[PDB]
Design a protein around this ligand. Structure first.
Ligand SMILES: O=c1cc(O)n([C@@H]2O[C@H](COP(=O)(O)O)[C@@H](O)[C@H]2O)c(=O)[nH]1
Ligand SMILES: O=c1cc(O)n([C@@H]2O[C@H](COP(=O)(O)O)[C@@H](O)[C@H]2O)c(=O)[nH]1
Ligand SMILES: [Cl-]
Ligand SMILES: [Cl-]
Ligand SMILES: [Cl-]
Ligand SMILES: [Cl-]
Ligand SMILES: [Cl-]
Ligand SMILES: [Mg+2]
Ligand SMILES: [Mg+2]
Lengths: 218, 222
């Protein structure tokens, strides 16, 4: 996947007018938008096609898919029907649940991203101890796209070691949660950035500033 | 007090088009006053489907969204979900206490309920979730969670979950029917069973529901 400026916008504003306006303000800087449940549950799945119509951007549906295989299949189908190019899936529920997502993605010409360790402090309780094994499970299942935490660069580096240089790795927790853009890009192919951009007084200047700080990594 | 689930039976309405979902739910309305609506239906038909169910049926709505994000995003998901009219939301515990707390805080503010999913019913649950489940359950109890979800497909596990959360906590359990769980045996430990396909794919969903209820007749409350 070829992400402009190695920067993915996490568009978690919850009203259509603001989400569209702010995305428009930063469109020159990005070509990849992560759309999650805050926006989708507030404005409907039609928002995905509308982003494509307005911006032509690729869309990653961050739905943290975490159900049994039968339900995971249905969620992936509904998500790809709405025009998402990729979907983010939890590994914690086990291999069968991940395989269910991989199957639908293959059928519809899309990608699965496997979330292995989360960026919140609570991730230390249960996920972190399973994360290396979840990553190896990804490798075993043929997963090529991964998500890992900007807030723990040593853990992000370990994830990169496990998955290899050929796999694609994106990383949230940059800015608001404390992660550094440049340090994160030592290990991740692309950084995910939400609030630092979409809640900034001037979102365009914020995006430009982040890009300036990583200009020698582009 | 806990939610009063008619016949101890919750419909998992995972049909993906509005017409079929509405028809089947209407067909079983005399048996079931509590419906679990998940992402298969919501992502296909929109959050207004919750409104439509409320309008058409006299049914409580549990939003099965397995909320599993960071605290900031979890809050937003819960707010949008309760705004749409869900009585309760199901959240994962494996992302940690902060993520669960975020949901509980919104539910408290908004006058709604959180259900904590501690273990899952799929075979894959043995890989990672099973080993964390007792601690996830204990964490729920420590956080003041009152409502829980655990798997009918593993009776010994469901029994242990009931022990951890105590008799006062409310426990619902999926995996009955299609996944192999038995209604009566599950109700030894769960307050209510969740049933999807063996009702909604039946030639006569009403007959299927009635049949499940007949098999557990002596377990209903006066
Ligand atoms: O471990 C993870 C996985 C995520 O998808 N995310 C998501 O990435 C985004 C982070 O946004 P922000 O830059 O505002 O912190 C949010 O949409 C969040 O749900 C995360 O923060 N941590
Ligand atoms: O561990 C769990 C947790 C669930 O919510 N579920 C949900 O319960 C329902 C089970 O439906 P069914 O009776 O068709 O197997 C589905 O909506 C599924 O997503 C489950 O099967 N296992
Ligand atoms: Cl399944
Ligand atoms: Cl925590
Ligand atoms: Cl957070
Ligand atoms: Cl498995
Ligand atoms: Cl068992
Ligand atoms: Mg609306
Ligand atoms: Mg720099």
């Amino acid at each position: 996947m070829d992400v402009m400026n190695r920067l993915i916008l996490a568009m978690d504003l919850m009203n259509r007018d603001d989400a569209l306006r702010v995305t428009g303000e930063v469109r020159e800087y990005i070509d990849t938008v992560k759309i999650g449940y805050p926006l989708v549950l507030s404005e409907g799945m039609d928002i995905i096609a509308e982003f494509r119509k307005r911006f032509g951007c690729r869309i990653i549906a961050d739905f943290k898919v975490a159900d049994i295989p039968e339900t995971n299949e249905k969620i992936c189908r509904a998500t790809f029907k709405a025009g998402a190019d990729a979907i983010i899936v939890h590994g914690f529920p086990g291999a069968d649940s991940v395989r269910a997502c991989l199957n639908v993605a293959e059928e519809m010409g899309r990608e699965v991203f496997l979330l292995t360790e989360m960026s919140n402090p609570g991730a230390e309780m249960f996920i972190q101890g399973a994360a290396d094994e979840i990553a190896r499970m990804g490798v075993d299942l043929g997963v090529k796209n991964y998500v890992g935490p900007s807030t723990r660069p040593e853990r992000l580096s370990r994830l990169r070691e496990i998955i290899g240089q050929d796999s694609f790795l994106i990383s949230p927790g940059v800015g608001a949660q404390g992660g550094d853009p440049g340090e994160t890009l030592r290990f991740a192919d692309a950084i995910i950035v939400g609030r630092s951009i979409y809640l900034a007084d001037n979102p365009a200047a914020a995006a430009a500033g982040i890009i300036e700080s990583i200009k020698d990594l582009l």
